[PDB]
Amino acid sequence: SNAQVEVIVMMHGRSTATSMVETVQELLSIESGIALDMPLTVEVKAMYEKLKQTVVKLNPVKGVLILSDMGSLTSFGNILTEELGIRTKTVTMVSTPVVLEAMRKASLGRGLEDIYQSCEQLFENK
Amino acid sequence: NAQVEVIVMMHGRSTATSMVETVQELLSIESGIALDMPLTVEVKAMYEKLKQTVVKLNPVKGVLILSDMGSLTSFGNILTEELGIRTKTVTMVSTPVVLEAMRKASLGRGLEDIYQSCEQLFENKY
């Protein structure tokens, strides 16, 4: 039922992504945005599988923006666009203000290109 | 054990904790200190407890604060002014920088060199 870019935050560790999303959700009073945490017990395989199941349920007509930190998580999106045909952008080295910007703009209905760029700018500025 | 103390300071219930703990488990080290600021904690209470945490750690080589956004970004300057302890602050902290930061600190590198190490990640992103 999509007027929005779906924003997925994927991070190493038990709750980095969850805590960041739960925080941006309270700051903006919004219910969008998805957290996928991969602790060191979950394989890269299994986690990519989880990304797949996840996206598929969100109706990503407007695309998916992946917010990631480092490593393999960083390349998932491109692999997904490849495998599933779903438009994707990834940002790496993500922190709270970035999640904040992304979920803010997504929920105003901005394009995937537009929200991606917004973020890369948070870095260019700092 | 007398190294640069790395304090990760973040918004949310466990962004900081989860980051510190991933990195500790990645490097099998026990150092690094997490401070989480949920919405139920006021800025002033957060600075107090940072202050009390730091006094107790007894840093002999300076303290490096890793933070996301907002007032947490200036706690570093204030703490130094208030007690004459040398701090530097990185803002927009992401797991890779907590990783680099705790790694080098573990090696016994100085504040200045670690700080520029983290700074250089954003540069090398760019």
TrEMBL record, chain A:
Ranges for domain PTS EIIA type-4 come to 4-126
Q: What is the lineage of its organism?
A: Bacteria, Bacillati, Bacillota, Bacilli, Bacillales
Quote the protein name from its UniProt record.
Lin1832 protein
Source domain of life is: Bacteria
Gene source species: Listeria innocua serovar 6a (strain ATCC BAA-680 / CLIP 11262)
From TrEMBL, chain B:
Q: Which superkingdom is the protein from? A: Bacteria
Transmembrane regions listed in the UniProt entry: none
User: Where does the record place the PTS EIIA type-4 domain?
Assistant: 3-126
Question: What is the protein's given name?
Answer: Lin1832 protein
Can you name the source organism?
Listeria innocua serovar 6a (strain ATCC BAA-680 / CLIP 11262)
| Full-length numbering of the shown residues | 542 to 665 of 892
